Design a protein around this ligand. Sequence first.
Ligand SMILES: Nc1nc2c(ncn2[C@@H]2O[C@H](COP(=O)(O)OP(=O)(O)O)[C@@H](O)[C@H]2O)c(=O)[nH]1
Length: 395
Amino acid sequence: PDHPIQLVWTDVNGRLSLDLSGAHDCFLNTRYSNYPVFILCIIGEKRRGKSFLMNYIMRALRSMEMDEEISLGADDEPLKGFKWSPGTETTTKGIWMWNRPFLLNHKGGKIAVFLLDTEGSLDIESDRETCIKLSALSLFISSHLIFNVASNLKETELDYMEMYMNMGEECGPKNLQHLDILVRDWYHSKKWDRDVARSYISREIEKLEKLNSYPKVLWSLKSNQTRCFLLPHPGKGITGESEGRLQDMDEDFQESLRSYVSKVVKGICTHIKTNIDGELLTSAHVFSMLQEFTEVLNLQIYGFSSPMEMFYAIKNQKLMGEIENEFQDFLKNQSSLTLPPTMRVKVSQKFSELLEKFMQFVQGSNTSSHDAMLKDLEVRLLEIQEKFCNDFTTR
Ligand SMILES: Nc1nc2c(ncn2[C@@H]2O[C@H](COP(=O)(O)OP(=O)(O)O)[C@@H](O)[C@H]2O)c(=O)[nH]1
């Protein structure tokens, strides 16, 4: 009985918890463990139709799995999410996924398509750091991210997008992070004009070019790497009480949804992701990356206010560890027969140089986190230095 499963939740203390058994049963089944995997994620504001679009994309994927044509019936009831929220039930917040993948055919192989809904993100101020960490975990394992927006792009959303752009830099050789900005309720009827979409795009690109911020999303927009899709209002047949049927939809919304679902489920085969090793990603790889990035986020104890800031904090904590190891190795190379005075001079100078190197290689502009990291690095290197010297006493 295929059902939705909650993969990652946020504990009361802010730690990110993972369903190890569920992720093992989903990503490591012997059937599709080595099939190339494709994770589709929907991030956006609540009550905007993310689960609805995911359910229709799911029906299209079922059609593709059984035969070869994308079809959706005119009177069929929904499945998963809210469009088919269980009679008298609703949903929780976190990362949710479809327990069973969808196997498609591409150039002699089977692609395992996983559907990931991020019910709960883009908060106003309700536990901001934890929401950032959850959405970052989602964006880390995603091969195609659909950002469900409701108007012009907001700073929060643009920062999330820049983070998604940056979180694929060491995930493959020439990895292109594919992003689909889905604007909801942008127009009513009016059929469609290819003018409204490129007008939205022109507005956004002007805003970003003046911002001198969010540069990589700006490049992706001006390079047609990230694509924007603007569908009309669903109509009162979907809003409120409804069984999410296409007979309950506006025909313009129906056709726009069909076009978008075609876009999304027909570009999977043409955009498989490669890892740094040069191989294609599989579901077991995704399980491993899930665990690894969950623990990486649970260990980011420094402060941040934006997604990009948490990205830079991850990187700078890694820099801290690298400098610690460099100092320890420098001390390991030092002889036990060196002149103690010149030895203390040398070690103090390595201390100073490593601190300056941290300062020159730090990333981001949050000088507060920079100072905190430098202070803690100073304390650790001081411990290392005094330890080496203390042992040098008895020698
Ligand atoms: N305004 C609007 N509502 C929609 C759209 N698609 C679905 N809805 C409705 O908005 C409600 C919330 O849907 P939901 O799937 O739960 O969105 P989600 O919470 O972000 O995942 C549902 O009852 C849908 O029927 C849309 O394109 N625009």
